[PDB]
Scaffold this active site. Structure first.
Site, PDB file in Angstrom:
ATOM      1  N   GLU A 295      40.202   9.262  67.309  1.00 32.42           N
ATOM      2  CA  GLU A 295      41.573   8.343  67.738  1.00 32.42           C
ATOM      3  C   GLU A 295      42.509   9.195  68.415  1.00 32.42           C
ATOM      4  O   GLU A 295      43.102   8.658  69.314  1.00 32.42           O
ATOM      5  CB  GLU A 295      42.182   7.823  66.433  1.00 32.42           C
TER       6      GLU A 295
ATOM      7  N   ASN B 103      49.368   0.146  74.888  1.00 30.82           N
ATOM      8  CA  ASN B 103      48.506  -0.948  75.216  1.00 30.82           C
ATOM      9  C   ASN B 103      48.973  -1.740  76.235  1.00 30.82           C
ATOM     10  O   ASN B 103      50.096  -1.681  76.696  1.00 30.82           O
ATOM     11  CB  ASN B 103      48.382  -1.649  73.866  1.00 30.82           C
TER      12      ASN B 103
ATOM     13  N   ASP C 266      49.155  -4.966  75.812  1.00 34.96           N
ATOM     14  CA  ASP C 266      50.051  -6.032  75.235  1.00 34.96           C
ATOM     15  C   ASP C 266      51.415  -5.795  74.722  1.00 34.96           C
ATOM     16  O   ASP C 266      52.198  -6.488  74.270  1.00 34.96           O
ATOM     17  CB  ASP C 266      49.381  -6.553  73.775  1.00 34.96           C
TER      18      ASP C 266
ATOM     19  N   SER D 200      52.220  -3.235  73.068  1.00 37.88           N
ATOM     20  CA  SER D 200      52.545  -2.136  72.132  1.00 37.88           C
ATOM     21  C   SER D 200      51.966  -0.802  72.442  1.00 37.88           C
ATOM     22  O   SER D 200      51.328  -0.766  73.331  1.00 37.88           O
ATOM     23  CB  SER D 200      51.701  -2.713  70.895  1.00 37.88           C
TER      24      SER D 200
ATOM     25  N   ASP E  90      50.034   2.946  70.374  1.00 38.11           N
ATOM     26  CA  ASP E  90      49.600   3.471  69.058  1.00 38.11           C
ATOM     27  C   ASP E  90      50.132   4.849  68.932  1.00 38.11           C
ATOM     28  O   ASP E  90      50.090   5.689  70.050  1.00 38.11           O
ATOM     29  CB  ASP E  90      48.030   3.372  69.058  1.00 38.11           C
TER      30      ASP E  90
ATOM     31  N   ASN F 144      49.534   1.368  65.190  1.00 38.35           N
ATOM     32  CA  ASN F 144      50.135   0.382  66.043  1.00 38.35           C
ATOM     33  C   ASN F 144      51.600  -0.266  65.914  1.00 38.35           C
ATOM     34  O   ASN F 144      51.861  -0.549  64.717  1.00 38.35           O
ATOM     35  CB  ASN F 144      49.268  -0.694  66.395  1.00 38.35           C
TER      36      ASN F 144
END
Length: 129
Positions: free
Chosen positions: A35, A46, A48, A50, A52, A59
């Protein structure tokens, strides 16, 4: 901060992740590796809107507030920046809530794609835990 493999393993073990909800320490170390590559500063934006954050790529859409994610919830009650510190306490406590949110560790796509079903015990090799 970039953790060594066994160094992170000890830290997680210390925060009670080994066998938490039935997930061996190896699973957690493996999730972290793919990750964020053990980098507490890792961030991924991301498409969208958002982002991480941290060693476990948590998130912003639902778990933390970064003040720039539409209709975002802050279920972990913390600023996303706290998930980028050298102390993983914040990330661990929040992770403990995500893994119990009804999907097990499937919440981490990297874990699902690279750790699920494998011999995760290897991620703990050479560690004096």
């Amino acid at each position: 901060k970039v953790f060594g493999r066994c160094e992170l393993a000890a830290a997680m073990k210390r925060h009670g992740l080994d066998n938490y909800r039935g997930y061996s320490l190896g699973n957690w170390v493996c999730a972290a590796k793919f990750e964020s590559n053990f980098n507490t500063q890792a961030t991924n934006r991301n498409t969208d809107g958002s982002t991480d954050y941290g060693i476990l790529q948590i998130n912003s859409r639902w778990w933390c507030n970064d003040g720039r994610t539409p209709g975002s919830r802050n279920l972990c009650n913390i600023p996303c920046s706290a998930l980028l510190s050298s102390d993983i306490t914040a990330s661990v406590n929040c992770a403990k809530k995500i893994v119990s949110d009804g999907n097990g560790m499937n919440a981490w796509v990297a874990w699902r794609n690279r750790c699920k079903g494998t011999d995760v015990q290897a991620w703990i090799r050479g560690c004096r835990l």
